[model samples]
Target: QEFDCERFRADIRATAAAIGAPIAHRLTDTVLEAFRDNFAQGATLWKTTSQPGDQLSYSFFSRLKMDTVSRAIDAGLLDAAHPTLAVVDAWSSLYGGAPVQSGDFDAGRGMAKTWLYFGGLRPAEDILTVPALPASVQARLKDFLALGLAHVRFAAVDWRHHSANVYFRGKGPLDTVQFARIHALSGSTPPAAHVVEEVLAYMPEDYCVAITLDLHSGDIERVCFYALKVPKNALPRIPTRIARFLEVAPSHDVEECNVIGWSFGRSGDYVKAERSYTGNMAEILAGWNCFFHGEEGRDHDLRALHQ
Candidate 1:
């Protein structure tokens, strides 16, 4: 079915509710409004990643692009404060606000030029990123591109908290070069030296490592890694993380439960796994099953669910 704006919204609410995320109502509304106005013109997807055993705490991302995102801000769509107005407005003066021209406005990079996300329940949880990045940030981003880091989308900054995040998917399997790439991307400090060692030593080759950086500076702010390819034999001590409260299972994507992040100033660490369940929400949600258990059972129940 062709994309329906309301359909995507419904699925996100249902899935977020299933996963127990507090539905950043205001954040969700702004993203939806942005979508309805501009981002909705192209292919879109909605997905979420949750922390292990934490129902109330999780993040959901929507893959969409808008050549006119400036309109959302102009239309009065996104607002965090009650006070966040000062921070964003201040940045807007220098960064030029949410306009699409803010960035180079290219959708050829990956699936989409942007991946809108909300962290936790607050309306302020909505992430703010100028479509156009600064020269300083773009220089390091160029380094990532040349390093085989494809699917490079979702460039963001935690303005409220002072950290930058770039989301990407690698082309080849995991290797030592990943560490080198991260070290180079991280500017002054290499992200999680020991954990980096462990990842190469034990974790599977396919993974998603969320690397946070200083907005303008190249310093490593934080890093989080999630297994992209599950079922590897190396994780004896690290069992596959599971979401037990669900039977409909929201989604059978197992990659989500296998994750861990690097900590730094005002940050910490933990392991988690997730599934994007991306693409069409109506079909994706319609196909969900309530008969599965863990990884093994998902496949089994899926066959039965379909049959």
Candidate 2:
């Protein structure tokens, strides 16, 4: 299969012009550098690296290009709902496959689905829960799904072994507030940082998960999970690092209430799992708002109690 360097360059130039000098220039540079380096490695890089598994591959241009598009969406420069023809053209050029346009939009989910399809991947199948979930668990799952699917714009799923993690770009107060805090906390950081690229859930174990990205690279840097209480003996099954991050006190009663925990690392091998103060759905929502939105989340009315 022949690859076109000249055509690729022209596409980059065209995209830069369409998206404005600032973003387009940077996007072009980031993408082209990856292209140049990877192309040098040979055209089979895509084929050589492509695998049936869901883990992220280390392809130079593909990875960077996807991140570029993700950042563009986060920056509010491109409208997923009403993207211009030029925007579609730019993505098509970069994608080097399937043509995408505004009409293809399915609410805000279309752009992401289209891109992933053209890029030789597919979004994970819609969530299907087991039939015999506890009433409490079912309620929590329903509530989470409502909040997430309503707002999520871009979503991806990676399933490995028995674990499946879903990542999404959603419109929420968390991103706006978290970015500011991350900026102040980090002495030096990228001009733009990740907004609300929240990780909604992890399946099989059916843990409720919250994940935040690194400010500059948009990589997963922190991950937290809230799980149904388990026996103390179950602690051994949990990774030590993850358990430590969760900060679970040995004395806490795991079966009486839900346990809240966190971890950091690519594989989420590190953790700090522990019992949470919030006893029920309302309490968890309040805690979540407080963590992400600060006072604003508190001030917002949290109505409808979940028994």
Candidate 3:
């Protein structure tokens, strides 16, 4: 509790060992280092003050362990060239993506493109199991509770911002027109906390989910539902329209309307949503689930992730 890193480190090591990791030392240390690295880069992203004419950017963090590894490195718990880095490289590479190149960092001094090489990895159906590594190198994700908890605090930002996605630099800037005001009290209230509770309570939970619904907007309303993830705060910031849509109170949040189902939208709404769904905003909501309305304002469907 209270950010006790020593305790966190102990938990990480213990959890790893508890899970029967032969390389528990390597797993815990490496995961911690990776988490640290993610946070170091993430904090940098949040602190960045942007201005006009700046390029947009984004941080990339798939999970808490990544950020924990980043944190450990900064605290002197691990090293970059450590064998754990190899593990992350091998694991993340499962995603189907390309390697990030240089010259990406705009305001920062340098970038940490560590996980970019592992872009090929994708979410799995049922269980996300990669072929087991050589038995000599056994390590699973269950061994990093300390790092995971710390990661919860750092989840709002993409600890991986400076690495894989070369989109923006510094805290992402938002133009004035986009930051419109809402006329409802619910628009400013905190998000429901249950979202976080449910995520932590589940084991090997599905981090993503979807929803559908029908609603009335400025014009003749059509059937529409949005995919929404769990909320981090009682009243977290979401798309302005969804946040201000009819002032649905956080206490009386409805899964189909009040909350989760705001991500999907017709193509037009999707475009507008994209303009507002900046990397910075997503990073801020990192701990909570995400909501996504589909393409142009044609269909009533959205996509989101839970856990």
Candidate 4:
């Protein structure tokens, strides 16, 4: 389906009410109206719902037309934390706004500002693969790759000019050199090398990196990396090998991939780091929580099971 501005509006309002957050209703309507009018009605461009903190709020994602952004700016709805106007101008100078998206945080107070991106044109043949990503983007990731990054999973222009939020999956023996190494990549100016080392050192094995790139002017604004710590000990009891010959035998190693994240950029926006393991996240959040016992999952079972 296409971007449902009405549903997004209704969900956000309902979500805000459930969370007890203060919301200005008419203001929300005005903002959603902007989104509704701008997004192409024919394409499935929008991410229908969001988890606990999307772009730092319970927000929806979509690609907006360049004109919509300039129009909003024309109406005084946009704001930038940095030199966004000039940057946007520079980008539009050549890229022509490249189809931006609406992003807001903290329970949809108002539009936080729009994000700029470029890709496949529209609904027809619009499935963009990474091959279609801009050359400058690929070049930047190539730089991070030198920092011991496994590879970039994805990247997006977040806010302001020159900055983007990116994610990388990697295994680390990473050190101070890795942090200091980004000096030449692209960002405003990263935190001290030693500090980054201290920060990166906190995670264990199978660590991944998520960075904020202030590309053109140069500044890797926020650097966050994390590793999952799965328990090693066998669960309760370990079955003996005698019955292993049976195809349906019961012995198997316990493995679990829990839902815990080290957020930054959009991920860390409205949610608190400390509130992570416990607190606010304990209950149901419209987009965040899932059902227990097998009920909360998908529709199929063995029929679609791998061959």
Supply candidate 1's per-residue lDDT for 176: 68
What overall lDDT, based on C-alpha atoms, would model 3 receive against the true structure? 0.26
Report the lDDT of model 1 for residue 118: 25
The candidate that wins on lDDT is 1
lDDT tens string, model 3, 77-146?
4455554354334444443423221111211222323332222212221011334233221221222121
What is the TM-score of each predicted model, taking all chains together?
A: 0.45, 0.23, 0.23, 0.43
lDDT of 2 by residue, 92-173 (tens): 4533444221111111111221222232221112221223222332233343344442211122222111111233222333
lDDT of 4 at 204: 36
Provide the overall lDDT of each model, using Cα atoms, as 2-decimal numbers: 0.39, 0.29, 0.26, 0.38
User: Which window of 10 residues has the lowest lDDT sum in candidate 4?
Assistant: 242-251
lDDT (tens digit, per residue) of candidate 4 on 244-263:
11112111112221122333
Candidate 1: tens digits of C-alpha lDDT, residues 41-127: 332332223344343222222333233334544645433332223333333343233312211111111111222322111111122
Error of 3 at 26 (Å): 27
Task: Name the lDDT value of residue 263 in candidate 4.
Answer: 34
Q: After superposition, how far is residue 13 of candidate 4 from its true place, in Å?
A: 1.4
